[PDB]
Amino acid sequence: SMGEAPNQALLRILKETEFKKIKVLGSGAFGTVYKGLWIPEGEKVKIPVAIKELREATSPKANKEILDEAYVMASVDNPHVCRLLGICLTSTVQLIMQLMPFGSLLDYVREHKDNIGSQYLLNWCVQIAKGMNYLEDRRLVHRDLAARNVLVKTPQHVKITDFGRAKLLGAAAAEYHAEGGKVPIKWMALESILHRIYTHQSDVWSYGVTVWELMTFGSKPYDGIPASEISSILEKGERLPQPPICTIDVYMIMVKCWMIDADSRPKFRELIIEFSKMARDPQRYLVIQGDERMHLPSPTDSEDMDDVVDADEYLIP
Numbered sequence: 001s002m003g004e005a006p007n008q009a010l011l012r013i014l015k016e017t018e019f020k021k022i023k024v025l026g027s028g029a030f031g032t033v034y035k036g037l038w039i040p041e042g043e044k045v046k047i048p049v050a051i052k053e054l055r056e057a058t059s060p061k062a063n064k065e066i067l068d069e070a071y072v073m074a075s076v077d078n079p080h081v082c083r084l085l086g087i088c089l090t091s092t093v094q095l096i097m098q099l100m101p102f103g104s105l106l107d108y109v110r111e112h113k114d115n116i117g118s119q120y121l122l123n124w125c126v127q128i129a130k131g132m133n134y135l136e137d138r139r140l141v142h143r144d145l146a147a148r149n150v151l152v153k154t155p156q157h158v159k160i161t162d163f164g165r166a167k168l169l170g171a172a173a174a175e176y177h178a179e180g181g182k183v184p185i186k187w188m189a190l191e192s193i194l195h196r197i198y199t200h201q202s203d204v205w206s207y208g209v210t211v212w213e214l215m216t217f218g219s220k221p222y223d224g225i226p227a228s229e230i231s232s233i234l235e236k237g238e239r240l241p242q243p244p245i246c247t248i249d250v251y252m253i254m255v256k257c258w259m260i261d262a263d264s265r266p267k268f269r270e271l272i273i274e275f276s277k278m279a280r281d282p283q284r285y286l287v288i289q290g291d292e293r294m295h296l297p298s299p300t301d302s303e304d305m306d307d308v309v310d311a312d313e314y315l316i317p
């Protein structure tokens with residue numbers, strides 16, 4: 001027998017005493033994300049982390065789901081994908097992840113709109129396409145790509161997250177079912193809404209919507225339309241409108257991601273190519289008032305911090 005290659009990823013189990021929670025970054029019914037610092041055993045290193053604790057969500061189903069997330073996050077290794085650093089098996093389990101201090105890309109474009117230039121937008125499109133192409137190479141279909149699920153390490157460096165709907169293409173044929181729900185309808189390809197089919201090319205659709213969110217500075221897709229209508233809207237041939245800043249060049253690429261025929265949508269590798277050409281001449285592809293004059297940061301705050309290392313530079317041997 002041989003059908004798929006062995007996943008030789010390492011799951012690191014960390015002690016409670018190696019790390020400290022400093023502030024809360026957010027909470028839902030999934031638990032609590034804390035901003036923290038991880039200091040590995042014997043290493044003269046301080047790594048800023050996000051610690052996602054289940055928060056006493058002692059459902060055995062929720063424990064299974066968050067360990068499924070942990071499985072995928074421990075298995076990925078790419079500059080544009082969030083990796084898991086380790087787990088801690090306290091009473092409520094804790095996932096230890098990299099701190100992405102500027103938050104989600106969605107909230108970033110909403111907050112910083114008047115200071116984001118075309119170079120940033122087009123580079124973010126390249127980076128998400130690189131991270132999605134990596135997931136495709138690993139045979140992973142993400143199933144929840146959206147600007148909320150892209151995080152910002154620096155304004156110059158984004159990564160995809162949220163692996164709690166992700167499925168391996170090659171996982172028992174059952175790609176006609178509501179794995180993790182069937183709920184992000186406004187980002188979903190039509191075949192996923194109607195049939196529960198999911199593919200790399202259905203993530204291309206969601207990529208198109210994600211780009212549309214970036215180019216509209218965080219506007220809600222199909223705002224005011226209930227999710228019940230979306231399928232019929234798409235079957236009748238309507239799509240999201242051309243964002244004001246977008247040339248027909250950029251918008252036609254979005255439109256191509258929303259073709260009914262999945263195989264006529266672009267591949268992630270081609271989206272990398274196309275957005276990279278556009279990123280060499282940004283003002284030709286997005287028209288933004290003030291573009292010539294924009295300035296986003298690169299460093300951070302941080303309080304004695306001499307041995308701080310970012311997780312991307314702390315490579316496990």
Ligand SMILES: COC1CCN(c2nccc(Nc3cc4n(C(C)C)c(C)cn4n3)n2)CC1
Pocket residue numbers: 025026030033049050052082083097098099100101102103104151161162
């Ligand atoms: C929904 O449950 C989790 C939210 C956080 N998520 C995740 N993955 C990898 C790294 C990572 N790092 C991070 C997340 C955040 N936030 C928000 C967005 C909470 C702020 C303000 C700073 N950081 N740093 N987060 C995974 C899913």
Ligand SMILES: [Cl-]
Pocket residue numbers: 156157
């Ligand atoms: Cl980079």
Ligand SMILES: [Cl-]
Pocket residue numbers: 216219241243244
């Ligand atoms: Cl709009």
Ligand SMILES: [Cl-]
Pocket residue numbers: 243244245246247248
């Ligand atoms: Cl225009």
Ligand SMILES: [Cl-]
Pocket residue numbers: 256266270274
């Ligand atoms: Cl193309």
